[PDB]
Design a protein around this ligand. Sequence first.
Ligand SMILES: NC(=O)c1ccc[n+]([C@@H]2O[C@H](COP(=O)([O-])OP(=O)(O)OC[C@H]3O[C@@H](n4cnc5c(N)ncnc54)[C@H](O)[C@@H]3O)[C@@H](O)[C@H]2O)c1
Ligand SMILES: NC(=O)c1ccc[n+]([C@@H]2O[C@H](COP(=O)([O-])OP(=O)(O)OC[C@H]3O[C@@H](n4cnc5c(N)ncnc54)[C@H](O)[C@@H]3O)[C@@H](O)[C@H]2O)c1
Lengths: 324, 328
Amino acid sequence: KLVITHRVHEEILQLLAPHCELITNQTDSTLTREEILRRCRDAQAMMAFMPDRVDADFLQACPELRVIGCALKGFDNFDVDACTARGVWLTFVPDLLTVPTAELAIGLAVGLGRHLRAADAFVRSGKFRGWQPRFYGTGLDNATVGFLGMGAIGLAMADRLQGWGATLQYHAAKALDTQTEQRLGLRQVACSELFASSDFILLALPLNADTLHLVNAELLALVRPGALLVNPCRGSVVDEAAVLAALERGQLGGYAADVFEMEDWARADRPQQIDPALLAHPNTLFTPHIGSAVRAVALEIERCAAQNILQALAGERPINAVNR
Amino acid sequence: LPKLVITHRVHEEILQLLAPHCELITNQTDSTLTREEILRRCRDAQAMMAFMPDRVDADFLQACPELRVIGCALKGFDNFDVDACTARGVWLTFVPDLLTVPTAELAIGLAVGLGRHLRAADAFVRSGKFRGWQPRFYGTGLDNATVGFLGMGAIGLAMADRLQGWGATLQYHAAKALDTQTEQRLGLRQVACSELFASSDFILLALPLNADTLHLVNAELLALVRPGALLVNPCRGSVVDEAAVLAALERGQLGGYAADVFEMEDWARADRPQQIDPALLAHPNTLFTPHIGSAVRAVALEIERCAAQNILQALAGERPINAVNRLP
Ligand SMILES: NC(=O)c1ccc[n+]([C@@H]2O[C@H](COP(=O)([O-])OP(=O)(O)OC[C@H]3O[C@@H](n4cnc5c(N)ncnc54)[C@H](O)[C@@H]3O)[C@@H](O)[C@H]2O)c1
Ligand SMILES: NC(=O)c1ccc[n+]([C@@H]2O[C@H](COP(=O)([O-])OP(=O)(O)OC[C@H]3O[C@@H](n4cnc5c(N)ncnc54)[C@H](O)[C@@H]3O)[C@@H](O)[C@H]2O)c1
């Protein structure tokens, strides 16, 4: 018995069908936590998506569970240790999400830098009347781009920015080997230096206890006036309220984000919404967690999660297991 | 001192560079100068510094017999009758490189923004109705896509430079082939025009407006595109037939149109439309910018400088470094 909480490609149902009894959700809807939990009561397997939160109380109510196959990279809403305590494999997708998310993050950098939203609303209002000196903005040429985090998305973005004439630097918990540093023209800097010397700041790190509200009032206070911040990872890696305050005083030049604190279900004090004053600020650009919203990629993400689930159900160690 | 007419506001530093050599008739106030007013200022001028709003035809030159050089603060001189300039011994100069990169940057941004439904995505978040991830808002990435470039000069190349590592298959069609070193370097393959339009997931324009390129992207070429193909125009409005573009959008064949430029601003075109069609402005599968390709302020100051230096070379009797025409 396998529960799939959200819609997947028919080809994926067909790969699963001969090994598993499928309890599926082929709608564009997200079901309530209580319905998902009802479906998983006697389930051996769960295919889990971004809206899902799995904790000890969840696992306790589902004693037959052998594997959670997550169709995602950041498992921050899944209690890994609780999974391991109850003999449950926790599985993720380590690479397939990286490229479309990195593409979006560059696009958001450029869009934020060039006042794309405002520019577009201006043409659409039928007020455009040929060239004027207006909407002057920030490009990547001769700029300094700093990466917080240098794993999959950091590296993919660094690859993609090779021809953009920018100076690249990064801060991470784990250093790149210096060979890769030379080849990508990356300089490793301290976090303070990162925030003080970067015209663009691209966040590329997971959400965990140590990264929660890491990007706070203190780090923001170090930024060059007009610096641009882009968040393609997890909302709670920044203090959205400190981001707002930084924008209102004019020090932060722009915040663009694909992700929001309000999505981070594992948090007891999770905000119920994005602050209306952040939505209203002109120096912003937002997308609704579409980092990997390419259909062709979704198929492969679904397939990878499916493969992991079938491996676990066959007694094997899943290739992308997150626990041991 | 030779008299120099500047049609638009310029940075103070540029006044200081020019005032020692020329009498300046400036427009630092940016007040709307009518053709008739510009002619009045230029009637006994030895030089004009021209910008994107300027249009110079044979009748204009005729009325300005002292002119020796028109210094253009721009790349695309489609609005300046070069041949008429040459025949009257007036240098015409432009700015070959300073506009390239920021325009290339904008256009990749527009490609990604168009591909990923940025406008609608942002509206949804800003609406207050975001509830977290959903299996919707699906888009088109660059990885595994075929990107076709029409034109392969300064901007075409800056764009190709910027797409290295993006996992895309790169192809192009131009009036002149790229050298093989550069095709090898950038992974670019040369193909016919029609082939480019039939096999590209992204089509990125990178060509000037002239009599051969006018309305080149017409109903005929658009009828070849893969359904869902995305078209990006950072060049001139009129290399495209916006009406044929709109119909291709409404039909559902063309997946999207993004533009930094519009037919309505191509002033030398007697028959240009008076506006961008409201139905195109209202179409969901679009993304627009108001001719801000070069709008990075570090860059505008240098654009003005370049045009100013060229004027000065011309006035000193030199052949100006960035002359477009060639004089006997
Ligand atoms: N918006 C989306 O659609 C989307 C898609 C995929 C991933 N993500 C999120 O992005 C995060 C990162 O993605 P990835 O694939 O690059 O992950 P990754 O694990 O490959 O890279 C993480 C990087 O962050 C660094 N890091 C960890 N703790 C840090 C700290 N305290 N300070 C500074 N750096 C630290 C690591 O050293 C590593 O360099 C994921 O955890 C996920 O939550 C979002
Ligand atoms: N949006 C902006 O702010 C902005 C900024 C700079 C330039 N531009 C416009 O972009 C245009 C292109 O700029 P560039 O710097 O790349 O010019 P360029 O002269 O360096 O390159 C033009 C390219 O177009 C090709 N071409 C010419 N006629 C063609 C045809 N009939 N079919 C196919 N290809 C043809 C040429 O072979 C050349 O490769 C300029 O003429 C200008 O109008 C716009």
